[PDB]
Structures are given as C-alpha cells and as structure tokens.
C-alpha cells in the first residue's frame, strides 16, 4: 500500500518506504 | 514501445519545419526536464504543475517547440541543449489535478547565449542552432552495425537510418555512456567524427556498474538487447511524471528484487515489473520483467534506468 | 508593549539594517517575534523606533549568504532589564519582498543591506483562490474563509505562511513577483503533499494534512519566541506520531495559556520535533494538541 | 535543571543535556 512515487516499489510498512525514498537522494 | 500506449491513446498527432542552422532564436526551457536530449530521441512527459501545463498549452498553439538544456552541474550550468518537438498531446484531469501528457521529438542543437525569465514565471533561453555536417561516412557506418550485431543485432534487423546524422544520433541515443560522454558527441557538429568517436567509444565499453557504489558489475554490453525500435534505451514516464531512460538487457547480476512483480502502468505490455536493487548499495536500479504469458518471445528481462549505471 | 506604515515604493533603492542572529524566512505579512539582549541589538531598535521601524530579514540560501529577503516593520515594542541585562522585545509585521544587492557590516556588527523593493504583480483566476480555499478547509476545518483576505496578492502570503513547507520551498515562492504563479505553486505543493516528516532521518512520518487545525486567526502555523528569542513556527495538529516525550509537562512561558508543554522528539533519531500541549483544566475543548516546529519537518 | 535554552527540555543528568542540545546544534 505504500508505493514510492519514483520506482513503485511498494512496502508493507512506511518506515521501509520512507528509507527506500532516502536512497533515491543519496542518503 | 516506442509508441507509449501506456500515457494515452486519444492523443492528438501533430511537423513543423526547422529553425534553419546559424539561425537566433527564443525558445522557452522546461526547467524540470534534466536529460542529455538527443535528436531523434522521443521524450514522454506528464506535466502536472500548473506552470508547466500553462506553458504547454500555450506552445502548442505555436511552434509545440521548447528547449532541453544541458546541465553538467544541476546552479544552471547549460552551456548547449536540445530543442523538441510536441508531435503528441493529451489534455487529462484526475484526483483533481489537470494533466497534461505530451510525446515530443529532440529536432535540433543549440548553444545557449542568453537565459533570462519573464513576468509570466516562464523562463527563454535565445539560442543559437548548431549547423549538421555531413559526409561520406559508409565505411563508418559499416563498422559500426557490424560491432552492433556483435552485441544485440545478432538478433536484431538492420534497420537503422541511412542519413550519417540520423544514425550518428541513433547511436547516440542507444549507448550504454555517461552523460558526461553523451554531451561530448552532441557537441560535434560533423557526423563523420561523430560517428568517428561512437566507433572509438563502441569498442571502449564492456561492463556497467553501479555509480553509487562503483564496486558492482550488473550487465555487460553483450546482454544488451531491443525489445522496441527505439533500439536497446528509450525513455519511459511513470504515472507520477518521472522520466527515465531505461537500457533493455537479458540477463544481470548484483541485484536484488522488492517485493512481488506487478503489471500496473507497465512500459513494455504483457509483461509485468518488480523494481531491482543493487545489493551492496540499494540503490535503486531498475526493473526486472516477467512475461504474463509462456507465448512471449523473450520471458525474463531487465530495464536498467541510466540514472544508475556508469560505463566500466 | 507599545503598540505602533512604512511602504517603499516598487524599484526604489533602500538601505534597511539587518537583524543577524535572525535565521528566518519571513512572509509578507506574516508576525515575527522577538527578544533581544545584544547591547547593540537594542541599540539598532532603539534606533528604528525613532525612524520608519523596519528592518531587513535575509532569505540564506546559505552556502555562507542569500539574494532575497523580506522587510519588518516594528509594531509591539516593549523594553524592561533582568540581572541588571535589558531586553527589548518586539512584533514585528513582514511588508515586502527585496532583492539584495550589497550586504555590509557595521562596526557594531549590526548588517545593513542595500536592497532593492521588489515589485508584486497580479493578476485574476478567482477560481484558484476558490480551489486553494477549498482544499485548505478540507484540510483544517476549522479555517474561516471569512479570516481569510480577498487580494490575490495579500492571499498568496497568507498560503505561504501558514503552509507546512521547508524553506527550500518557501524561498522558491517570495522569489515569484506574481500572485497568479505564487498561487500556482502553492496549489502544486497542496495537490502533492499530505504527510510530514523529521528532517535529520526523515524515516518518521510525524503527522498528516488532516491533523492540522487553527487555533487563531494567524491560522495552522505561527512563530513565538522562547525565554531566550529562540524563534519557533509552530504546526499545531491534533494527533502526532513516532514522538517520545521528555519527563513531565512544564506551565513556564506557555505560548497558548491553558496548555502545559513537554518536549517531543523524533523516535528514531531523537530530533526536536515541538511539544504536546496538554490542558490543565477539563473545561478546555481541545485538552490535548501538538505544536510542531516548521524547521524539524519537512513535506513527503 | 540542566534546561536547554532552545526547545526547555529538562533534564536531571547534565550529560543528558549535552548530547540533547548536540542534535540541535550541527542539527
Ligand atoms: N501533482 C500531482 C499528481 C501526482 C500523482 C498523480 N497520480 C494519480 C493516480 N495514480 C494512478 C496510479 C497509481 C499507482 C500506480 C502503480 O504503478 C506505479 C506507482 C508508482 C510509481 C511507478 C509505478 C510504475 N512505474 C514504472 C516501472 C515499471 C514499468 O514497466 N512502467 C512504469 O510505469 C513507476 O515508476 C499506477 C497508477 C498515478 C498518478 C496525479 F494524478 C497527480
Ligand atoms: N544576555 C542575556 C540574557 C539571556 C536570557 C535571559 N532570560 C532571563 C529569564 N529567564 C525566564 C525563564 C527561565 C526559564 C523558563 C523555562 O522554560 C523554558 C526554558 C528554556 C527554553 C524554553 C522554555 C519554554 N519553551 C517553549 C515551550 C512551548 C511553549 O508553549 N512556550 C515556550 O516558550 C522554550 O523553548 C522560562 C522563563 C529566561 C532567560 C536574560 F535575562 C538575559
Ligand atoms: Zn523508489
Ligand atoms: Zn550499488
Ligand atoms: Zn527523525
Ligand atoms: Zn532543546
């Protein structure tokens, strides 16, 4: 349910999603 | 794929007749588009910031032209750019927000002389179109689709362009280079050491890495393959409007998968797509792709985003 | 607190002194608060009180020094002295928007800016102020169009104040002369925004659009300054996550007299976030609420 | 009582304090 907006990678949980975000940037 | 059934089917087909060479003109930037454009190449947007959808509309009662500079620090560093060509527009509205989906053609370079904004919020840059030279290029051009059946046309029909300027810029467009290289070829203005440098480049590139690690072999040009007549790279937007440029392989290594496949919005019909990872680094990748159905010709493969990749 | 209209004319050339320990990027129209200790510091206000009463907030896009700013104009002023140190404290009101041209430092160490007074062009679309109101109730709730101005341009800088943006975005508007592209972008950024993060992990989603709710007419955000002029722009909502609390609720220096406050911060890296404010007294509606400082958050 | 000056987070060790006002500085 929650899906990156760059890749659709989606995750069970949002922190998961959150630091899956980060790495797009660098991070 | 090329034809990008994904954003819209009752899309309006407009083409234009070009800016002549040595010629000055004014053209608006779209800012957000950050790619090496190459002329020829076909570019997929999905605009959803007012500005930006304000502006399109009203290039296409114009010249449907905007310019694509190119950044080699983005802080606006473009010395040089790309001009493209809206051959394709749809006018969309969703979740309340207005869409616009647009399918424009890079046409022409340019070098950047002057870049200023207006009071509308949209900036021009005037530029200066860059001349095509030609030649005689057979040899070149020989040499160069043999080494290409070498890696993907063992498989893949020689239908390339016949133009020296239309096939050093299809080469162009399907490299597997870093941008920094891709600015290079743009920046020659004679096919002939255009094609020239493409051949010095084809038998330079063997392996791509990761570029955030830099310690991770995922392909090599020999699993290079084409699925469309774009070549092996073409660009793709995804429903939330990002662009990318997505190199098609058979096979790859140092990657791991996230999560179980799907076949929403997908670029390549019938099959379906689990994004990929590298597995020192987790950065994002690309996509792997499974057919939906045993009759597809290829069954497996993989869609590399460049953004990702560095040659060797 | 001696209550107090300076207004350069468009492409007029100024020279406004700049309040340095100021690290903010001020709105037009929006309330600045503050509380200074610096001998010099109340020297420059003692100064303004007695001229046109502003002064210049610097916009840094740090690297530093910063290209825009935004004019204050005084209009509380209060001074009094503890251990024998006077204070002055003042509101001040952002007025207008300027591009830096030259930025010197005075012996004292008080900055003075030669600036130039941007111009505010305008414009129609009525229907995008209708639609940025009618997300924003959606969003609050509690909004009252009515407390809401009617000028596009006077509009547009209400949005920009009280929208939980990071500064990157914050500067990007103010940068735009005109209300119509200013109430574009902001429609952009509501249409692509629900959820707020901490900045320093940015691994917590803290709270949600929805949870925003007006407890003034500032509207959902506003800026109060500490018992020690550490200025904060508080996001008050209704419900937060991934926040632990720092040991019992404190009544000192309340900015919403009522509440009580305890220190909240980020779960996963220990952050500041803002405080839970909690009511001393059943008869309060609201009992529980949360005040999120804008510089710890930043939009999905 | 160990207060920091920027957000009033009290503590009742000092060096709780000190690792508290390090996240806000360098923040
Ligand atoms: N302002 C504003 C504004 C913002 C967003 C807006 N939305 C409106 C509604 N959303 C519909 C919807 C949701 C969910 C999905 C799942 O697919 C997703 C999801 C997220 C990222 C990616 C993909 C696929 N994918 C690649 C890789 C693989 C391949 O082969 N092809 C691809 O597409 C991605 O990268 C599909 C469509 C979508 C758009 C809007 F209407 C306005
Ligand atoms: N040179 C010089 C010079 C410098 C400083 C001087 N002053 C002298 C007098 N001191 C009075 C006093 C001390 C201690 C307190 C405890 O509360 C504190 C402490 C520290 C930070 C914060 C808070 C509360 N809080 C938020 C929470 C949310 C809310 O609702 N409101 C808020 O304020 C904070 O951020 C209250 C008042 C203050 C310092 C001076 F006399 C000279
Ligand atoms: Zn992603
Ligand atoms: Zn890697
Ligand atoms: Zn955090
Ligand atoms: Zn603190």
Chains 1, 4 share one sequence.
């Not at chain 2, 994904?6 to 002549?20: C, I, K, P, S, W």
């Not at chain 2, 597997?176 to 290079?184: G, Y």
């Not at chain 2, 590298?278 to 953004?307: E, N, V, Y």
Request: hydrophobic share 35%; net charge negative.
């Amino acid at each position: 349910p929650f899906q990156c907006n760059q890749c659709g990678a989606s995750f069970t949980q949002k922190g998961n999603l959150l630091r899956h975000i980060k790495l797009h940037s660098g991070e | 794929p090329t034809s990008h059934t994904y954003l819209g089917a009752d899309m309006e087909e407009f083409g234009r007749t070009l800016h002549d060479d040595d010629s000055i003109q004014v053209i608006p930037v779209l800012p957000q588009v950050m790619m090496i454009l190459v002329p020829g190449q076909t570019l997929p947007l999905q605009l959803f910031h007012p500005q930006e959808v304000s502006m399109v509309r009203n290039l296409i009662q114009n010249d449907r032209t905007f310019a694509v500079l190119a950044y080699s620090n983005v802080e606006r560093e473009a010395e040089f750019g790309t001009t493209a060509e809206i051959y394709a527009y749809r006018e969309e509205q969703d979740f309340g927000i207005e869409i616009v989906k647009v399918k424009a053609i890079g046409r022409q370079r340019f070098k950047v002389l002057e870049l200023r904004t207006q009071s509308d919020g949209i900036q021009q840059a005037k530029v200066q179109i860059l001349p095509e030279g030609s030649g005689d290029a057979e040899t070149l051009m020989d040499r160069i689709k043999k080494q290409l059946r070498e890696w993907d046309e063992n498989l893949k029909d020689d239908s390339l362009p016949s133009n020296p300027i239309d096939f050093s810029y299809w080469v162009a467009a399907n490299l597997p280079i870093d941008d920094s290289l891709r600015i290079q070829l743009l920046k020659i203005d004679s096919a002939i050491q255009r094609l020239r440098c493409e051949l010095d480049i084809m038998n330079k590139c063997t392996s791509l890495c990761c570029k955030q690690c830099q310690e991770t072999e995922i392909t090599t040009k020999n699993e290079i393959f084409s699925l469309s007549r774009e070549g092996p790279m073409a660009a793709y937007v995804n429903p939330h409007g990002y662009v990318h440029e997505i190199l098609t392989v058979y096979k790859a290594c140092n990657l791991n998968l996230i999560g179980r496949p799907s076949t929403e919005h997908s670029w390549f019909p019938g099959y379906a797509w689990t994004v990929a990872q590298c597995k020192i680094c987790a950065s994002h990748i690309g996509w792997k792709f499974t057919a939906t159905k045993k009759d597809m010709s290829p069954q497996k493969f993989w869609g590399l985003t460049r953004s990702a990749l560095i040659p060797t």
